[PDB]
Structure 1
Amino acid sequence: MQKHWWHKATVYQIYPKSFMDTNGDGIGDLKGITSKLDYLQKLGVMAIWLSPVYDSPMDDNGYDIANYEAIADIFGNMADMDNLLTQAKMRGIKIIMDLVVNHTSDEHAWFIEAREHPDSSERDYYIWCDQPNDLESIFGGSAWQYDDKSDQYYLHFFSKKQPDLNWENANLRQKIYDMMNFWIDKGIGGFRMDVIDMIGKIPAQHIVSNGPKLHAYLKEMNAASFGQHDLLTVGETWGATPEIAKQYSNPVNHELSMVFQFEHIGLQHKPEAPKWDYVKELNVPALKTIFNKWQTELELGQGWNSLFWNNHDLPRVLSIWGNTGKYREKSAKALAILLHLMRGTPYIYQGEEIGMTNYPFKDLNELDDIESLNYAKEAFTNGKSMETIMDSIRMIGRDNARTPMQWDASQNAGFSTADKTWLPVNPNYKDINVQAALKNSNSIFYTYQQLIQLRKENDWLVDADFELLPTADKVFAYLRKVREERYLIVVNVSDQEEVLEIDVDKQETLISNTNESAALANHKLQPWDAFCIKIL
């Protein structure tokens, strides 16, 4: 197991439009991010996964790129970007850019030429057809959009303004590599690869993710760009299984460092049902099976896990799986303890470290996300009341993760000085904000800070194995072992008292949000009790 700088790293995901606004337009920008690097350094993260800040029409808020080498005017300019890289590096922080190459904006120059001149080479940069099959767009409707100018349908698994790139075109792939090397030379620390498991798509055969040439393309990409460097590459792979992740992350395959797997996220909705048909409560026994599987199947040297609870497309963890009332702070720490002490690279989504929650959206106008808006329009004429629709969106809507970062108790939680913010600031900012989190020595922030420091200083977080222990349904306990070291992690993922039928010899407490001694002696766990102790 060759160790790289990122094996001890914790990554922080920033959603640019909602992090920090510095010019009063109600939207976050690059200078905003740069001004908060001391805060992130204090937190201890070693890298930032920066969501798209490239030139874009914003149909999918940055994931529909019109120019891979230009900063969207709304975030600032290339000078601001360069300074961010510089200032971040000065503080031990690397920047991981969001690589979105499965598709581009329909306003990208390649597509404009493809449509304007169907004989051009860029025409083959996309996927066209005369007779469309029944493939569907992930944002609703057909994945094929009819273009009346050229008289053919172009593929788009996402919005109509996000035409898919043709990865069978070796020349297109090379263009992508040239663009990737453009960013590599600027000093980035890696790439977060957007739906990367779709580049092996074969539309005509209804093959989307995990296509036959997927890994060959990744090997080619690696060899043509990031491979020669020591960067962190993580792919967003919704169709990833432990076996597939081994192929992606085992160093011997020369592909990626790790990938985001969404099997645990699948528990947020009924099996074989739309994400909108959400599950009210976390099936802890189900989560235990999934986490244990990924921990066991990806043994050191054979692969590497990424660890996350939420992102810019998911409900904040406290709202979907934690507690947002009497045990908000405690459940937040519990969930933090539970995830970060497993083997892998953990990712913290902005606001997660202070325990932010979903937002109580009142109506559709207040929303912004095309996915939710498309869902609402369809659902309303298919048996769903507006109230039922708004209820699903308040729980699952991607906009819940996109409300402004809550810095303090001043106007707009200190996010901006503008009359209004692009997305509304959650009123709970009066109680939930960075300033208040930093002031309280035992706040959620310090739990994450401590977890981050434990990983940077102790090899066992990486070297130790993982063993799930038999416990009550809602109790998530496991031990990490290596050499003469044995670590016991116990987390009561429950709003109520649970049993703990174990006997151990505690020799050291690494971290705890409660009186771990009392729990061990009384053989019972208080709601959301969580701790890691070194045992004999």
Structure 2
Amino acid sequence: NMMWWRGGVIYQIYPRSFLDSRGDGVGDLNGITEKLDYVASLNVDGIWLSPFFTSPMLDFGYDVSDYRDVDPMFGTLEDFKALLEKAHSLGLKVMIDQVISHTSDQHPWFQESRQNRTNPKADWFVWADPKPDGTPPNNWLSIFGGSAWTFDSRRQQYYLHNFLTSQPDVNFHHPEARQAQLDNMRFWLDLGVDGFRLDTVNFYFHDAELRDNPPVPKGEAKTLGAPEANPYTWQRHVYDLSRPENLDFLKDLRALMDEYPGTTTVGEIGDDNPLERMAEYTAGGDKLHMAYTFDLLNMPHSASYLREVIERFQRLAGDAWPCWATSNHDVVRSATRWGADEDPHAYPKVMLAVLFSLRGSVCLYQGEELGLPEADVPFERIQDPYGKVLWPEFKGRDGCRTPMPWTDGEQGGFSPVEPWLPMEARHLELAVSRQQDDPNATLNTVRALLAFRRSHPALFDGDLSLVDVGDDLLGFTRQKGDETLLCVFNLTGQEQQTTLPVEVASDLPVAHFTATRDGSTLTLPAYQAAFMQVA
């Protein structure tokens, strides 16, 4: 089963906010180990851990100061080996973040690099002289605010950072820096991890000529990877990322992965044309195994929008392989972002049915299986630096990073002390303990859906074909071998009805969904899904 990743369902864990087992208010590895039984009980195939490596935590793990160790705050390397082994014993794959596009400015490489222009690591990062007036070398902007260039008096030069000033970008034009990052990944492969989520995977290379980006012409759509209030959205991102050289490197990265049969990679795409980039990066069988985009992580969510996404993707490279996600640690929780104006109990159910029925792998975010709404974090409790630069038009990412509600008791059973972000009051009645034995709760709908999906080869990696089912329903068939299934979804809060475009052999009952099939007319009550075996 060395192709489990190609259609597999991955559960994303944000270690800080999963379970505190030690009592400091921050989630740790041992807490995860303690909850792997729950995770396995979701019927997912594995997990992806957000960064737990040595880090100042200025971007909460994504500023790495030691690639081959666990930060004391999360536990130890031994804790991780225990987690990994227990996870394997439960049949779970374990993937971890790898953040190789940039290091913390506390990383020894950068400490060395910044001292002068001639040291051995001077070119391991991206340095450039000021313009004659002393200003940044070009017009590139940090996603987290201000210029992508920061002046350093030691070298009398600017260094590049797409993200925080404390996250200097690695210069992939330097083959030794590239190889060093491969070696860092190899370290975790040798411990037996099953794969990597590759942070900002298309950011690796920048244009060495340092060309200015062009502006976005007035009225044109902005990138899906950033809020519209961010001036980063005012330029087309052509030279600051997604360079051709990255393809060669992705091959190298893939070669590394191939030395460890059965391992996989999911790349994070942040690009002006993300579907295209994802097809580009996952094609050929010699680069990334899969990647996800922000196409399903934004505001549009109608059945017609989903149709547009599917069509667009279907026109791309036939050998590409997408990983789909409706939530992660960077966006408003789906039940709010997509379902704010929908029934809070029924909408997440059908939305997840769609997610689990699309052709691709799936990433499912911690708490999404509980139908958790976005949390409201008060100003004085804000932690994410990305929540302190565009406030209040954009309030950062803490709203999706609040601690996991295990019980309806104090701190949701997450911690014995006040946690690093406040437990959301609305989450308590949606806690795991409250939801565990309720067959009508979103948790059990998810368990049921993933068991169902697991029982049908066509829902693993079958082809997908859109079918006419009217304007307000989403419909397609999934096909593999003997099996062709018809999948129809009502994402609206009103009854909808359609003529079946194919001929139904039988109904497939799943997770208490209710739909009326009368001859050739299919009726779906609000927020219902319907699966049918096709003749």
One fold, TM greater than 0.5? yes
8 Å CA contact 1:296, 1:466 repeated in 2: no
Letter in structure 2 aligned against 1:248: Y
Report deviation, 1:428: 1.3
Which residue is equivalent to 1:245? 278
1 CA distance for matches of 2:314 and 2:370?
A: 27
8 Å CA contact 2:369, 2:446 repeated in 1: yes
1 CA distance for matches of 2:205 and 2:356?
A: 32
Taking the TM superposition and a 5 Å limit, the aligned residue runs for 1:47-86 are: 47-86=46-85
Letter in structure 2 aligned against 1:370: P
Relative to structure 1, is the Cα distance of residues 333 and 520 closer, same or farther in structure 2, using a 3 angstrom cutoff?
Answer: farther
Which residue is equivalent to 2:368? 352
Q: Which 10-residue stretch deviates more, 239-248 or 282-291?
A: 239-248
Which residue is equivalent to 1:272? none
1 CA distance for matches of 2:263 and 2:509?
A: 30
Root-mean-square deviation over aligned CA pairs: 2.2
Relative to structure 1, is the Cα distance of residues 225 and 502 closer, same or farther in structure 2, using a 3 angstrom cutoff?
Answer: closer
Which residue is equivalent to 1:415? 414
Q: Does 1:313 align with 2:346?
A: no
Which residue is equivalent to 2:436? 438
Report deviation, 1:227: 4.8
Runs (4+) of structure 1 exceeding 4 A deviation are 225-228, 240-243, 518-523
Report deviation, 1:64: 0.4
Residue among 150, 158, 165 paired with 1:160: 165
1 CA distance for matches of 2:107 and 2:497?
A: 58
Q: Does 1:205 align with 2:221?
A: no
Structure 2 counterpart SS, 1:515? coil
Question: Among the aligned pairs, what percent are the same residue?
Answer: 32
1 CA distance for matches of 2:248 and 2:115?
A: 32
2 CA distance for matches of 1:358 and 1:187?
A: 35
Which residue is equivalent to 1:19? 18
Taking the TM superposition and a 5 Å limit, the aligned residue runs for 1:119-518 are: 119-131=118-130, 132-202=137-207, 204-206=210-212, 207-239=239-271, 241-250=274-283, 252-265=284-297, 267-268=298-299, 282-295=301-314, 297=316, 299=318, 302-323=319-340, 327-362=343-378, 364-376=379-391, 386=392, 389=393, 392-393=394-395, 397-418=396-417, 420-502=418-500, 504-505=503-504, 507-517=506-516
Letter in structure 2 aligned against 1:284: A
2 CA distance for matches of 1:145 and 1:473?
A: 50
2 CA distance for matches of 1:227 and 1:334?
A: 40
8 Å CA contact 1:22, 1:29 repeated in 2: yes
Relative to structure 1, is the Cα distance of residues 55 and 483 closer, same or farther in structure 2, using a 3 angstrom cutoff?
Answer: closer
Letter in structure 2 aligned against 1:348: L
2 CA distance for matches of 1:89 and 1:523?
A: 43
2 CA distance for matches of 1:296 and 1:437?
A: 41
Q: What are the superposed Cα offsets for residues 166-191 of structure 1, whole Å, 9 maximum, x if unpaired?
A: 00000111111111111110010001
Structure 2 counterpart SS, 1:74? coil
8 Å CA contact 1:127, 1:164 repeated in 2: yes
| Unmatched runs of 5 consecutive residues or more in structure 1 | 269-280, 377-385
8 Å CA contact 1:334, 1:492 repeated in 2: yes
1 CA distance for matches of 2:51 and 2:181?
A: 16
2 CA distance for matches of 1:324 and 1:18?
A: 27
Relative to structure 1, is the Cα distance of residues 92 and 121 closer, same or farther in structure 2, using a 3 angstrom cutoff?
Answer: same
Report deviation, 1:48: 0.8
How many residues were matched structurally? 500
8 Å CA contact 1:477, 1:489 repeated in 2: yes
Relative to structure 1, is the Cα distance of residues 226 and 73 closer, same or farther in structure 2, using a 3 angstrom cutoff?
Answer: farther
Relative to structure 1, is the Cα distance of residues 12 and 463 closer, same or farther in structure 2, using a 3 angstrom cutoff?
Answer: closer
Relative to structure 1, is the Cα distance of residues 370 and 308 closer, same or farther in structure 2, using a 3 angstrom cutoff?
Answer: same
Report deviation, 1:198: 1.3
Q: What are the superposed Cα offsets for residues 473-528 of structure 1, whole Å, 9 maximum, x if unpaired?
A: 33212122344433111111112233334375351314254321368887543221
Task: Specify which structure has the higher proportion of helix.
Answer: 1
**Structure 1 length-normalised TM:** 0.88
2 CA distance for matches of 1:445 and 1:520?
A: 33
Q: What are the superposed Cα offsets for residues 197-234 of structure 1, whole Å, 9 maximum, x if unpaired?
A: 11121151341232020100111222245555321101
Q: Does 1:40 align with 2:56?
A: no
Letter in structure 1 aligned against 2:49: L
1 CA distance for matches of 2:24 and 2:517?
A: 52
2 CA distance for matches of 1:401 and 1:313?
A: 7
Report deviation, 1:293: 2.9
1 CA distance for matches of 2:315 and 2:458?
A: 16
2 CA distance for matches of 1:292 and 1:512?
A: 28
2 CA distance for matches of 1:524 and 1:253?
A: 42
Report deviation, 1:338: 0.7
Structure 2 counterpart SS, 1:168? coil
**Structure 2 length-normalised TM:** 0.88
Structure 2 counterpart SS, 1:439? coil
Report deviation, 1:261: 1.8
Structure 2 counterpart SS, 1:527? coil
Structure 2 counterpart SS, 1:346? strand
Relative to structure 1, is the Cα distance of residues 138 and 227 closer, same or farther in structure 2, using a 3 angstrom cutoff?
Answer: farther
8 Å CA contact 2:6, 2:461 repeated in 1: no
Structure 1 counterpart SS, 2:267? strand
1 CA distance for matches of 2:258 and 2:161?
A: 27
8 Å CA contact 1:318, 1:324 repeated in 2: no
2 CA distance for matches of 1:226 and 1:109?
A: 29
Structure 2 counterpart SS, 1:87? helix
8 Å CA contact 2:296, 2:325 repeated in 1: no
